[PDB]
Amino acid sequence: HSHPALTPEQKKELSDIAHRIVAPGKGILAADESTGSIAKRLQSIGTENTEENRRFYRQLLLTADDRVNPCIGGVILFHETLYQKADDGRPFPQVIKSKGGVVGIKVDKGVVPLAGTNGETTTQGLDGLSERCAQYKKDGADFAKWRCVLKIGEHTPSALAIMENANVLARYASICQQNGIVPIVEPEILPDGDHDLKRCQYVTEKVLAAVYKALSDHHIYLEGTLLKPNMVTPGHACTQKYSHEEIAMATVTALRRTVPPAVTGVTFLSGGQSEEEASINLNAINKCPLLKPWALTFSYGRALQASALKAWGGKKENLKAAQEEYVKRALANSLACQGKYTP
Amino acid sequence: HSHPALTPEQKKELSDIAHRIVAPGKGILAADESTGSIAKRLQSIGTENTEENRRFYRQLLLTADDRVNPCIGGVILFHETLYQKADDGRPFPQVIKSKGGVVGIKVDKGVVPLAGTNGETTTQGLDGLSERCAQYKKDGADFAKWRCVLKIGEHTPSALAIMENANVLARYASICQQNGIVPIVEPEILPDGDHDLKRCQYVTEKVLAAVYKALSDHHIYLEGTLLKPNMVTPGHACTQKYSHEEIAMATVTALRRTVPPAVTGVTFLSGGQSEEEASINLNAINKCPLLKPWALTFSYGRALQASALKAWGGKKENLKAAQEEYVKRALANSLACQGKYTP
Amino acid sequence: HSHPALTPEQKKELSDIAHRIVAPGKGILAADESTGSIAKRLQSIGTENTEENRRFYRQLLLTADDRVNPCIGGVILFHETLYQKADDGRPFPQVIKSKGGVVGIKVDKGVVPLAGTNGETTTQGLDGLSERCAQYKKDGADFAKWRCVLKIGEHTPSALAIMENANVLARYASICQQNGIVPIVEPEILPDGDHDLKRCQYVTEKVLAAVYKALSDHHIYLEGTLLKPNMVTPGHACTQKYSHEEIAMATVTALRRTVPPAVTGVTFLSGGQSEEEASINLNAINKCPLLKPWALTFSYGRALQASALKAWGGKKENLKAAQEEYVKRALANSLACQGKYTP
Amino acid sequence: HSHPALTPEQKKELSDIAHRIVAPGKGILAADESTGSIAKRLQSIGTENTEENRRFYRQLLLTADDRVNPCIGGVILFHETLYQKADDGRPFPQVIKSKGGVVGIKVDKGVVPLAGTNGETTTQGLDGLSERCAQYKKDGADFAKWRCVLKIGEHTPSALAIMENANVLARYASICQQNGIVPIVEPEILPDGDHDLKRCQYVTEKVLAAVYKALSDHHIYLEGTLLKPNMVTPGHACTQKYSHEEIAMATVTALRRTVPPAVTGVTFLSGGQSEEEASINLNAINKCPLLKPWALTFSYGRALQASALKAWGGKKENLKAAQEEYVKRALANSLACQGKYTP
Question: Which residues carry the post-translational modification Phosphoserine, per the record (chains A, B, C, D)?
Answer without folding.
Answer: 34, 37, 44, 130, 270
